[PDB]
Short mmCIF file of N, CA and C in Angstrom, two decimals:
data_model
loop_
_atom_site.label_atom_id
_atom_site.label_comp_id
_atom_site.label_asym_id
_atom_site.label_seq_id
_atom_site.Cartn_x
_atom_site.Cartn_y
_atom_site.Cartn_z
N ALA Y 1 -19.34 -23.09 -29.60
CA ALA Y 1 -17.92 -23.35 -29.35
C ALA Y 1 -17.33 -24.32 -30.37
N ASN Y 2 -18.16 -25.17 -30.98
CA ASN Y 2 -17.67 -26.16 -31.93
C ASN Y 2 -17.04 -25.48 -33.15
N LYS Y 3 -15.72 -25.59 -33.29
CA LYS Y 3 -15.00 -24.84 -34.31
C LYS Y 3 -13.62 -25.46 -34.50
N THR Y 4 -12.92 -24.99 -35.53
CA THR Y 4 -11.57 -25.46 -35.81
C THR Y 4 -10.60 -25.01 -34.72
N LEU Y 5 -9.49 -25.74 -34.60
CA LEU Y 5 -8.60 -25.59 -33.45
C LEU Y 5 -8.04 -24.17 -33.36
N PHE Y 6 -7.44 -23.68 -34.44
CA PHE Y 6 -6.86 -22.34 -34.40
C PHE Y 6 -7.94 -21.28 -34.18
N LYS Y 7 -9.07 -21.42 -34.88
CA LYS Y 7 -10.16 -20.47 -34.68
C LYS Y 7 -10.75 -20.57 -33.28
N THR Y 8 -10.90 -21.79 -32.75
CA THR Y 8 -11.50 -21.92 -31.43
C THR Y 8 -10.58 -21.35 -30.35
N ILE Y 9 -9.26 -21.52 -30.47
CA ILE Y 9 -8.37 -20.93 -29.47
C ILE Y 9 -8.31 -19.41 -29.64
N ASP Y 10 -8.35 -18.93 -30.89
CA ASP Y 10 -8.33 -17.49 -31.13
C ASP Y 10 -9.56 -16.82 -30.52
N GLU Y 11 -10.73 -17.45 -30.65
CA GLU Y 11 -11.93 -16.89 -30.04
C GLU Y 11 -11.97 -17.13 -28.54
N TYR Y 12 -11.34 -18.20 -28.06
CA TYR Y 12 -11.26 -18.45 -26.62
C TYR Y 12 -10.48 -17.35 -25.93
N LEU Y 13 -9.41 -16.88 -26.56
CA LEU Y 13 -8.65 -15.77 -25.99
C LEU Y 13 -9.51 -14.51 -25.88
N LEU Y 14 -10.33 -14.25 -26.90
CA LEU Y 14 -11.03 -12.96 -26.97
C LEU Y 14 -12.26 -12.93 -26.07
N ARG Y 15 -13.23 -13.80 -26.32
CA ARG Y 15 -14.56 -13.62 -25.74
C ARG Y 15 -14.87 -14.58 -24.60
N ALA Y 16 -14.39 -15.82 -24.67
CA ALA Y 16 -14.84 -16.88 -23.76
C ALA Y 16 -14.27 -16.68 -22.36
N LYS Y 17 -14.69 -15.59 -21.73
CA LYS Y 17 -14.27 -15.24 -20.38
C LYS Y 17 -15.40 -14.47 -19.70
N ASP Y 18 -15.31 -14.37 -18.37
CA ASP Y 18 -16.31 -13.65 -17.59
C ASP Y 18 -15.66 -12.66 -16.64
N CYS Y 19 -16.46 -11.95 -15.84
CA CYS Y 19 -15.94 -11.01 -14.87
C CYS Y 19 -16.75 -11.11 -13.58
N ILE Y 20 -16.12 -10.75 -12.47
CA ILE Y 20 -16.75 -10.81 -11.15
C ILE Y 20 -16.41 -9.53 -10.39
N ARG Y 21 -17.41 -8.92 -9.77
CA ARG Y 21 -17.20 -7.74 -8.94
C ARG Y 21 -16.18 -8.02 -7.84
N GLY Y 22 -15.26 -7.06 -7.66
CA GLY Y 22 -14.30 -7.14 -6.57
C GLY Y 22 -14.69 -6.36 -5.33
N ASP Y 23 -15.72 -5.51 -5.42
CA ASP Y 23 -16.09 -4.65 -4.31
C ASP Y 23 -16.95 -5.35 -3.27
N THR Y 24 -17.69 -6.39 -3.65
CA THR Y 24 -18.78 -6.90 -2.83
C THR Y 24 -18.52 -8.33 -2.41
N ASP Y 25 -19.21 -8.76 -1.35
CA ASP Y 25 -18.96 -10.07 -0.77
C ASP Y 25 -19.35 -11.19 -1.74
N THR Y 26 -20.56 -11.14 -2.28
CA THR Y 26 -21.05 -12.21 -3.14
C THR Y 26 -20.65 -11.96 -4.59
N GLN Y 27 -20.58 -13.04 -5.36
CA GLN Y 27 -20.06 -12.99 -6.72
C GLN Y 27 -21.14 -12.46 -7.65
N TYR Y 28 -20.95 -11.22 -8.12
CA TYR Y 28 -21.82 -10.60 -9.10
C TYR Y 28 -21.13 -10.54 -10.45
N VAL Y 29 -21.92 -10.56 -11.52
CA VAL Y 29 -21.39 -10.42 -12.87
C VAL Y 29 -21.32 -8.94 -13.22
N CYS Y 30 -20.14 -8.48 -13.63
CA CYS Y 30 -19.95 -7.07 -13.91
C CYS Y 30 -20.43 -6.72 -15.32
N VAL Y 31 -20.75 -5.44 -15.51
CA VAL Y 31 -21.02 -4.93 -16.85
C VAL Y 31 -19.69 -4.72 -17.56
N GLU Y 32 -19.71 -4.85 -18.88
CA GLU Y 32 -18.47 -4.91 -19.65
C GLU Y 32 -17.67 -3.62 -19.53
N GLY Y 33 -16.35 -3.77 -19.45
CA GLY Y 33 -15.43 -2.65 -19.47
C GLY Y 33 -15.05 -2.07 -18.12
N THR Y 34 -15.79 -2.38 -17.05
CA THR Y 34 -15.49 -1.80 -15.74
C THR Y 34 -14.15 -2.30 -15.21
N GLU Y 35 -13.95 -3.62 -15.21
CA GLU Y 35 -12.71 -4.20 -14.71
C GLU Y 35 -12.38 -5.44 -15.53
N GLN Y 36 -11.11 -5.83 -15.48
CA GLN Y 36 -10.56 -6.77 -16.45
C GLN Y 36 -11.25 -8.13 -16.38
N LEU Y 37 -11.20 -8.84 -17.50
CA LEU Y 37 -11.83 -10.14 -17.64
C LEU Y 37 -11.02 -11.21 -16.92
N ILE Y 38 -11.62 -12.39 -16.78
CA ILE Y 38 -11.07 -13.48 -15.97
C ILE Y 38 -10.81 -14.67 -16.88
N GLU Y 39 -9.56 -15.14 -16.91
CA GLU Y 39 -9.23 -16.34 -17.66
C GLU Y 39 -9.73 -17.57 -16.92
N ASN Y 40 -10.37 -18.49 -17.65
CA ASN Y 40 -10.89 -19.73 -17.07
C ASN Y 40 -10.49 -20.90 -17.96
N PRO Y 41 -9.44 -21.63 -17.59
CA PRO Y 41 -9.05 -22.81 -18.38
C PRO Y 41 -10.14 -23.85 -18.49
N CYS Y 42 -11.01 -23.96 -17.48
CA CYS Y 42 -12.09 -24.95 -17.53
C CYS Y 42 -13.06 -24.69 -18.67
N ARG Y 43 -13.15 -23.44 -19.13
CA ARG Y 43 -14.07 -23.12 -20.23
C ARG Y 43 -13.65 -23.79 -21.53
N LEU Y 44 -12.34 -23.97 -21.75
CA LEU Y 44 -11.87 -24.59 -22.98
C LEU Y 44 -12.11 -26.09 -22.97
N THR Y 45 -11.66 -26.77 -21.91
CA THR Y 45 -11.81 -28.22 -21.85
C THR Y 45 -13.22 -28.63 -21.44
N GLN Y 46 -14.00 -27.70 -20.87
CA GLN Y 46 -15.37 -27.96 -20.42
C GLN Y 46 -15.42 -29.08 -19.39
N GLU Y 47 -14.45 -29.08 -18.47
CA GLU Y 47 -14.41 -30.05 -17.39
C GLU Y 47 -13.98 -29.35 -16.11
N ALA Y 48 -14.37 -29.93 -14.98
CA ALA Y 48 -14.10 -29.37 -13.66
C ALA Y 48 -12.96 -30.11 -12.99
N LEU Y 49 -12.50 -29.56 -11.84
CA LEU Y 49 -11.39 -30.12 -11.08
C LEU Y 49 -11.89 -30.79 -9.81
N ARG T 1 -0.91 9.67 -14.55
CA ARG T 1 -2.09 9.07 -15.15
C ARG T 1 -1.71 8.45 -16.49
N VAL T 2 -2.51 7.48 -16.92
CA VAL T 2 -2.28 6.75 -18.16
C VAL T 2 -3.55 6.81 -18.99
N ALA T 3 -3.40 7.12 -20.28
CA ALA T 3 -4.55 7.19 -21.18
C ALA T 3 -5.21 5.83 -21.30
N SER T 4 -6.54 5.81 -21.27
CA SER T 4 -7.31 4.58 -21.35
C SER T 4 -7.83 4.37 -22.77
N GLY T 5 -8.18 3.12 -23.06
CA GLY T 5 -8.67 2.74 -24.37
C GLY T 5 -10.14 3.08 -24.55
N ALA T 6 -10.60 2.96 -25.79
CA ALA T 6 -11.99 3.24 -26.11
C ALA T 6 -12.92 2.26 -25.40
N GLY T 7 -14.10 2.73 -25.02
CA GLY T 7 -15.07 1.91 -24.33
C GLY T 7 -14.85 1.75 -22.84
N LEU T 8 -13.95 2.53 -22.25
CA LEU T 8 -13.59 2.46 -20.85
C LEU T 8 -13.54 3.87 -20.28
N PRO T 9 -13.93 4.05 -19.01
CA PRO T 9 -13.87 5.38 -18.39
C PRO T 9 -12.46 5.95 -18.36
N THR T 10 -12.38 7.23 -18.01
CA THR T 10 -11.13 7.98 -18.05
C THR T 10 -10.73 8.40 -16.64
N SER T 11 -9.45 8.27 -16.33
CA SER T 11 -8.94 8.67 -15.02
C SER T 11 -8.90 10.20 -14.92
N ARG T 12 -9.47 10.72 -13.84
CA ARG T 12 -9.50 12.16 -13.62
C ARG T 12 -8.21 12.65 -12.97
N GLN T 13 -7.94 13.94 -13.13
CA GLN T 13 -6.80 14.56 -12.46
C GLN T 13 -7.10 14.72 -10.97
N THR T 14 -6.14 14.33 -10.13
CA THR T 14 -6.27 14.46 -8.69
C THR T 14 -4.96 14.96 -8.10
N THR T 15 -5.06 15.81 -7.08
CA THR T 15 -3.91 16.32 -6.35
C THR T 15 -4.15 16.12 -4.86
N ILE T 16 -3.10 15.70 -4.15
CA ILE T 16 -3.19 15.37 -2.73
C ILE T 16 -2.23 16.26 -1.96
N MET T 17 -2.74 16.94 -0.94
CA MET T 17 -1.94 17.75 -0.04
C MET T 17 -2.00 17.15 1.36
N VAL T 18 -0.83 16.96 1.97
CA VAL T 18 -0.73 16.32 3.28
C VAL T 18 0.22 17.14 4.14
N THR T 19 0.05 17.04 5.45
CA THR T 19 0.83 17.80 6.42
C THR T 19 1.38 16.87 7.48
N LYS T 20 2.64 17.08 7.86
CA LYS T 20 3.28 16.35 8.94
C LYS T 20 3.63 17.30 10.08
N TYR T 21 3.85 16.72 11.26
CA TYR T 21 4.14 17.49 12.46
C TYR T 21 5.29 16.84 13.22
N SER T 22 5.78 17.56 14.23
CA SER T 22 6.99 17.19 14.95
C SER T 22 6.66 16.59 16.31
N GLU T 23 7.64 15.87 16.87
CA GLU T 23 7.54 15.26 18.18
C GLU T 23 8.38 16.04 19.20
N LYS T 24 8.09 15.80 20.48
CA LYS T 24 8.73 16.51 21.58
C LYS T 24 9.14 15.52 22.66
N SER T 25 10.38 15.64 23.14
CA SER T 25 10.88 14.72 24.16
C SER T 25 12.09 15.28 24.89
N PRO T 26 11.92 16.23 25.80
CA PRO T 26 13.06 16.73 26.58
C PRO T 26 13.61 15.67 27.52
N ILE T 27 14.91 15.77 27.79
CA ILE T 27 15.61 14.82 28.65
C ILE T 27 16.34 15.59 29.74
N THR T 28 16.53 14.95 30.89
CA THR T 28 17.09 15.59 32.07
C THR T 28 18.00 14.64 32.83
N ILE T 29 19.11 15.16 33.33
CA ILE T 29 19.97 14.41 34.24
C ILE T 29 20.61 15.37 35.24
N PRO T 30 20.44 15.14 36.54
CA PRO T 30 21.03 16.03 37.54
C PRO T 30 22.38 15.54 38.05
N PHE T 31 23.15 16.48 38.57
CA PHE T 31 24.37 16.15 39.29
C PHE T 31 24.45 17.03 40.53
N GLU T 32 25.11 16.51 41.56
CA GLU T 32 25.00 17.07 42.90
C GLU T 32 26.38 17.20 43.53
N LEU T 33 26.52 18.19 44.41
CA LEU T 33 27.73 18.41 45.17
C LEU T 33 27.36 18.73 46.61
N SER T 34 28.30 18.46 47.52
CA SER T 34 28.11 18.74 48.94
C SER T 34 28.71 20.10 49.30
N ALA T 35 28.31 20.60 50.47
CA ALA T 35 28.80 21.91 50.92
C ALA T 35 30.30 21.89 51.16
N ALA T 36 30.82 20.80 51.73
CA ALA T 36 32.26 20.71 51.97
C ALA T 36 33.04 20.76 50.66
N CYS T 37 32.52 20.10 49.62
CA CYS T 37 33.18 20.10 48.32
C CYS T 37 33.32 21.52 47.78
N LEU T 38 32.21 22.27 47.76
CA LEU T 38 32.25 23.64 47.27
C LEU T 38 33.14 24.52 48.15
N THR T 39 33.08 24.33 49.47
CA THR T 39 33.89 25.14 50.37
C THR T 39 35.38 24.92 50.12
N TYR T 40 35.79 23.66 49.95
CA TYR T 40 37.20 23.39 49.69
C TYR T 40 37.61 23.78 48.28
N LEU T 41 36.68 23.75 47.33
CA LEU T 41 36.97 24.24 45.99
C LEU T 41 37.23 25.75 45.99
N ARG T 42 36.36 26.50 46.66
CA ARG T 42 36.44 27.96 46.61
C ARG T 42 37.44 28.52 47.61
N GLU T 43 37.43 28.00 48.85
CA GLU T 43 38.03 28.70 49.99
C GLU T 43 39.01 27.79 50.72
N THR T 44 40.29 27.88 50.34
CA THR T 44 41.35 27.22 51.08
C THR T 44 41.77 28.07 52.28
N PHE T 45 42.32 27.41 53.30
CA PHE T 45 42.81 28.10 54.48
C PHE T 45 44.04 27.41 55.06
N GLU T 46 45.02 28.22 55.44
CA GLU T 46 46.27 27.84 56.09
C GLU T 46 47.22 27.09 55.16
N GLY T 47 46.76 26.76 53.95
CA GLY T 47 47.62 26.32 52.87
C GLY T 47 48.55 25.15 53.12
N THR T 48 48.38 24.43 54.23
CA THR T 48 49.25 23.30 54.52
C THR T 48 48.99 22.16 53.55
N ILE T 49 49.86 21.14 53.61
CA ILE T 49 49.87 20.09 52.59
C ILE T 49 48.54 19.36 52.53
#
């Protein structure tokens, strides 16, 4: 993740996201392309709420 | 349907046929007359005032 500001935000938009199954009770990680990715602001600042 | 991008599944053609039906609710109201009423309506006698 250590990178220049414009490059780090540009890559944060593209890849630095995850996905979670919507069909099932517990949180599973989906295989790529099935359903849309999830934006996580905590991933950029690397801090919790 | 909307065309999907590369690396993602494709929406299939689907057609839906459905049927509706009607309701039924007859209504009733009676009215009544007495024998004297019908007798005086149909059959006058002696014609006095």
